[PDB]
Design a protein around this ligand. Sequence first.
Ligand SMILES: NC(=O)c1ccc[n+]([C@@H]2C[C@H](COP(=O)(O)OP(=O)(O)OC[C@H]3O[C@@H](n4cnc5c(N)ncnc54)[C@H](O)[C@@H]3O)[C@@H](O)[C@H]2O)c1
Ligand SMILES: O=C(Nc1ccccc1-c1cn2c(CN3CCNCC3)csc2n1)c1cnc2ccccc2n1
Ligand SMILES: [Zn+2]
Length: 273
Amino acid sequence: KLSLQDVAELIRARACQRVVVMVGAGISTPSGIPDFRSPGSGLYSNLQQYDLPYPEAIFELPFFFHNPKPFFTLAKELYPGNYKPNVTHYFLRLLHDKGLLLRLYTQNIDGLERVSGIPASKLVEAHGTFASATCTVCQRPFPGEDIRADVMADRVPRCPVCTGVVKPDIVFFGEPLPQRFLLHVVDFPMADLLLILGTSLEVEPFASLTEAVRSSVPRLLINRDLVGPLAWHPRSRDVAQLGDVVHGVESLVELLGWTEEMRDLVQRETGKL
Ligand SMILES: NC(=O)c1ccc[n+]([C@@H]2C[C@H](COP(=O)(O)OP(=O)(O)OC[C@H]3O[C@@H](n4cnc5c(N)ncnc54)[C@H](O)[C@@H]3O)[C@@H](O)[C@H]2O)c1
Ligand SMILES: O=C(Nc1ccccc1-c1cn2c(CN3CCNCC3)csc2n1)c1cnc2ccccc2n1
Ligand SMILES: [Zn+2]
């Protein structure tokens, strides 16, 4: 069986160079991103005023059209520039500057990856972005700030053409994933180390994508617990690092060498925040 020390070594030795990364909800825990399933949080109570068939309706269309506000209360809350990224994101970015990040796939819609300084050439925001939008009728792309003005002031924006409701480019149920997800196919075979952090591997196709990388590719899970297929039938080259995702990450960071360089980077980056 492998271990953190082991994986560390392969990254240093330069025998891992082609690192694909899967993040979900847990990387953007330490940054503050409140869950609307968990009570006791601005967002939770705010979304209770609106009566809601069931939590998912927030990301269903037919409902959205019957009443957006629930979705928008959330948009307002996550709109760029109210949540810093944390150390988990800033490693991923360091991973990048070291020439190692093949691609980073995320089920998160906080865009904390971008704001951490990862170029979007490297990201695949599989559940969408807030940085754009689209009249639900008369069809036009709109940049993100174009509507922000309203979003912060609680109003539900319209196209200056349709007057149809402009909707941020969060993927809703019933729709298929961003086109961008077509790398699904090249990235995974091209990967020589898969890195799974802060995800429960529960939503599709992330469950599936973990079994994509080749047979002999190690999967370093860093999570509160062991999940998905890494649990339900693991591979010899899997190595789990259970625990807080940060005391996971900063552990690795040392094993490799970069405790220093990490701090340096977090300095430049939160002097600009
Ligand atoms: N920040 C966000 O954008 C955000 C927030 C909440 C939910 N989501 C959605 C929820 C889901 C994302 O991934 P998903 O697999 O579903 O997340 P999940 O919320 O269902 O699971 C999170 C996983 O991480 C583990 N975990 C959570 N926090 C930590 C932590 N702080 N340290 C170590 N381990 C932790 C937890 O056990 C679980 O296995 C998608 O539907 C997202 O769109 C996104
Ligand atoms: O309860 C939360 N998350 C989910 C839990 C279970 C199942 C689905 C989603 C869930 C689904 N979903 C979609 C839609 N899906 C896209 C992919 N296939 C089609 C459907 C876009 S974002 C999102 N989360 C949840 C989600 N986002 C949050 C964001 C900020 C704060 C708290 C949040 N809590
Ligand atoms: Zn329009």
